[PDB]
Amino acid sequence: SASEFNILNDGPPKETYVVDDAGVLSRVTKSDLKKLLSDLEYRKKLRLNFITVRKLTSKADAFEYADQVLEKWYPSIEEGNNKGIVVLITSQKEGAITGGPAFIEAVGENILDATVSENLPVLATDEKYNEAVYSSAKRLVAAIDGQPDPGGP
Length: 153
Ligand SMILES: [Ca+2]
Prior knowledge:
- By secondary structure, the protein is an alpha/beta fold.
- It has helices spanning 2-10, 27-44, 62-73, 77-80, 101-107, 109-117, 119-125, 129-144; strands spanning 18-20, 47-53, 83-89, 94-99.
- A 4-stranded mixed β-sheet has the order 1-2-3-4, with helices on both faces.
- A hairpin with a 4-residue loop joins strand 3 and strand 4 (94-99).
- Helix 2 runs parallel beside helix 8 (129-144), helix 6 runs parallel beside helix 7 and helix 7 (119-125) runs antiparallel to helix 8.
- It is globular, with a radius of gyration of 14 Å.
- The N and C termini lie far apart (32 Å).
- The relative contact order is 0.16.
- The site of calcium ion (CA) has 5 residues, from loops.
- This is UPF0603 protein At1g54780, chloroplastic.
């Protein structure tokens, strides 16, 4: 699909932290994401990007595609070490999260697995894409900052 290709092709958003290809997020929430994530990057030197896509032309799943984006956008560990990539496939109500070792290590498997099995699928099923993405961003940030886990929906 032009979507699957564009997302890969266009590379990472170095000004915004979001590629809303499915167009399911409001400009206000995208502004709030940029603020939250630009602050995370300033403080912890971790660059977390969110990607929304309606459907994947290929048969690959969310995690497979997330990994494909990580490797294409950041083709070396020097570039990808502190990078995190969250994918949300809106039609499937499925999410995935991948990243470099430093990013993965900072979040922890507990929160990584919880965000993808709770916040993302649950909120998107209820058509709350803005909350799905922003609550996930908040939950991952809390894990990174060693703060109390806000929990899922
Ligand atoms: Ca799309």
